[PDB]
Structures are given as structure tokens and as C-alpha cells.
């Protein structure tokens, strides 16, 4: 059922049955004041009905104003609800492919995972623990970084799937080959690591102190272009549908949402900068390294890290140090080429520059697959 609105858009009314103390199997995140259906979990009523979609904004549920609520309030609320739930939604503008037959993939884990030790887990309640040798039934890989799975030997009636890390096949030894950086085709320098470790600062210090060499990939946005902005260099200003289409078409390295608009750095954006003879400078979330490495961009990833816990206390609010060091225990993937321990910006910058400069004269080891 759909209802047109005077000022806003057309809303969507769906009805899903809810059992007392039994979750629907859908997760919600806050984007500004809005409540957004962010994920549909397999095995719940929400999934079976096929009435809720990722990206659907929840305006009302059974006469209750949902918009404006913290997701913690929405969580407490629906936990105390049952019976027929009438949803009033602003239907998702995302583009999911036509329904494929549920394809299960059975894997064996060669690593231990405890979601309570994971800072990155999107919905902690859904975290699924497993040990080396456990067999996982991966029901959904729609989210490359978070697979929905059941663990074989899970004695409790689940009934919902769990979330597990979507790691690529990391071998014990990965075959490597030397790659010389061409004179006119610089490798994109890409920075990763915790937030407040001066990463954004080191970028701008490079972009400014050596303006002639470095450049930035022109990102895309759904935000309407402003007065003193140019449609070429500031952003590629596109409609939301175009952005959503590009997302589905795997055209984005990384994309996020800011103030009810989408922003993202396209693969072509970087490939264009490479072709200019300039060094593309780009900060990414560790999560987005998967999409990045799978393209022929030949990136050089530098990990930017804070010092030890004790040395962090010397330089120093309290909730920040806990967050950094927690992210540092998870750096074991080691997709990066080199790490920089930022204690002093000036000391970190010179080391950063020295690393970037060295690419001109000295060849580097890349996965052999990049050259073949």
C-alpha cells in the first residue's frame, strides 16, 4: 500500500507479523535524524516477507513517530512490541539485483574469531563466533565485508543468521613480483589506519607543501552543486539514481553518506589522476581496501599508526585512546606496504615523503597477480 504526501514523497505501507520477544531479523542505523533499515537478516520474518529493503527509511510503526529516534530507542521499542506491525516507509533508493536463488557456500575457518573483540562489527548482537576448523554455512555475501552465516554445531535454535568477517583468501605465502613505478604513471598513495592519528593532517601537509606533485581524485556526490563550485574539479555532481547505479555497477572504491547525501571516490576518478602524471593521494577506511586491490590501480598502501599505549599517555579524550589501540590489535591483515608510527607530525611527514619519493628510483613488491 502506498500513500502520497502533500510536501514530501510517496510513502510505502507494509504489514509484517511480529512474535513476542522474537526479533524481525532487520537492523536499523541512524542517518541524521532518520531511522534506516540497514540490513535484512536471513531466517527472520522480515526477510521471509520481503517487505523490508535495505535503505528503507522508517517513518512510523503502528502510529508511533519513529523518525527522530535514536536506534537504541527503536531497539527497546520493538523488543516490547508484537502482533501485526504496520510500517510507514520512504522506500529505499538503493538498487539491489533481481532475486537470485539462495546460494549457500560451505567454508572451513582457519582462524579464530570473537565478535566481542571486534570494533568493526556493525551489529554486535549478530556477531557469530567461531574457531579454527569450524564449518560455516555462508548464506549471504551481499555485503562483501560481512557475510551472513550459520555455524555447524550451533546447538541453540538460531533462528537468525550471524555476521562473520568477509576475508578474501589470504595464503600463508603470497607470491610477489617486482614492479617499477613508471615515470609518468605514479602509483596512488593510499593512507589507512585509526582516525585521529594525524592521517588527514599529513595529507593536507603533502597536498600543500608539495602542491605540484600531488592531486586528489574528484569524488562523486548527490548533493546539488553550490554557487562557487565547478562540476568538473570539486565533485562529479550526479543524481542519486546515477550514484546508486554506479554503486551497484562496482564503480566505487569507497562511498558513504553525509547529511542525507552520498559521497564516494570512483575507480575512474583515481585512474584519471594516475594518467596525469601526478600522485593520487587518498584516505580510505580499511574496509574499502578489498575493492581497491581488485582493480588495476597498483596502489601503495601506507598504514598510519599511533605510538604505544604508554607513549600515547605521555603525549596526552580517554575514550579515544581506548578506540585507537583497539583498532591496532586488528591490523593483522597486513595488506599495507609500510607502517608509519606517527609521534611527531614533522617526523612522520618526512618519513612519509621519503617513502613516497623512493617509488621513483626503487622498485617494489606487489602481488604477482597485479602484473599477470
Amino acid at each position: 500500500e502506498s500513500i502520497g504526501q502533500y510536501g514530501g514523497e510517496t510513502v510505502k505501507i507494509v504489514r509484517i507479523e511480529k512474535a513476542r520477544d522474537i526479533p524481525l531479523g532487520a537492523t536499523v542505523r541512524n542517518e541524521m535524524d532518520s531511522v534506516i533499515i540497514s540490513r535484512i537478516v536471513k531466517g527472520g520474518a522480515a526477510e521471509k516477507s520481503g517487505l523490508l529493503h535495505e535503505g528503507d527509511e522508517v517513518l512510523e510503526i503502528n502510529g508511533i513517530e519513529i523518525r527522530g529516534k535514536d536506534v537504541n530507542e527503536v531497539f527497546d521499542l520493538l523488543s516490547d512490541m508484537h502482533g501485526t506491525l504496520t510500517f510507514v516507509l520512504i522506500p529505499s533508493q538503493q538498487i539491489k539485483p533481481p532475486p537470485a536463488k539462495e546460494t549457500v557456500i560451505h567454508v572451513k575457518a582457519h582462524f579464530d574469531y570473537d565478535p566481542s573483540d571486534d570494533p568493526y562489527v556493525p551489529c554486535r548482537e549478530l556477531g557469530l563466533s567461531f574457531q579454527k576448523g569450524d564449518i560455516l554455512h555462508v548464506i549471504s555475501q551481499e555485503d562483501p565485508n560481512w557475510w551472513q552465516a550459520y555455524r555447524e554445531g550451533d546447538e541453540d535454535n538460531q533462528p537468525l543468521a550471524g555476521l562473520v568477517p568477509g576475508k578474501e583468501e589470504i595464503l600463508t605465502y603470497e607470491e610477489m613480483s617486482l614492479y617499477h613505478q613508471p615515470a609518468n604513471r605514479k602509483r596512488p598513495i593510499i593512507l589507512i589506519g585509526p582516525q585521529n592519528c594525524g592521517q588527514n593532517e599529513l595529507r593536507q601537509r603533502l597536498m600543500n607543501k608539495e602542491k605540484d606533485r600531488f592531486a586528489s581524485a574528484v569524488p562523486h556526490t548527490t548533493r546539488s552543486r553550490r554557487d562557487q563550485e565547478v562540476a568538473g574539479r570539486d565533485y562529479h555532481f550526479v543524481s542519486r539514481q546515477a550514484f546508486e547505479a554506479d554503486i551497484a555497477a562496482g564503480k566505487f572504491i569507497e562511498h558513504g553518506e553525509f547529511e542525507k547525501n552520498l559521497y564516494g571516490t570512483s575507480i575512474d576518478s583515481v585512474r584519471q589522476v594516475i594518467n596525469s602524471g601526478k600522485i593520487c593521494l587518498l584516505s580510505l577506511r580499511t574496509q574499502s581496501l578489498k575493492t581497491l586491490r581488485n582493480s588495476d590501480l597498483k596502489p601503495y598502501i601506507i598504514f598510519i599508526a599511533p605510538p604505544s599505549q604508554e607513549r600515547l599517555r605521555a603525549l596526552l579524550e580517554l575514550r579515544e585512546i581506548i578506540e585507537k589501540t583497539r583498532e591496532m590489535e586488528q591490523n593483522n591483515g597486513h595488506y599495507f606496504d609500510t607502517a608509519i608510527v606517527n609521534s611527531d607530525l614533522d617526523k612522520a611527514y618526512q618519513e612519509l615523503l621519503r617513502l613516497i619519493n623512493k617509488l621513483d628510483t626503487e622498485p617494489q613488491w606487489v602481488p604477482s597477480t597485479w602484473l599477470r
Binding site: 540497514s38 536506534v71 537504541n72 527503536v74 551489529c123 586528489s216 569524488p219 558513504g256 553525509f258
Partner: peptide, 18 residues
């Protein structure tokens, strides 16, 4: 610098099960 692009670098909103 682009103010918006520095924001999207921050960790995504936490989810919660309904």
C-alpha cells in the same frame, strides 16, 4: 580540502537489531 569527504572516513553508524 573537501569537508564532506573527511566525514565519510569516520566509522559508519552502529546498527541495532529490531
Amino acid at each position: 580540502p573537501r569537508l564532506e569527504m573527511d566525514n565519510v572516513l569516520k566509522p559508519p553508524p552502529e546498527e541495532r537489531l529490531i
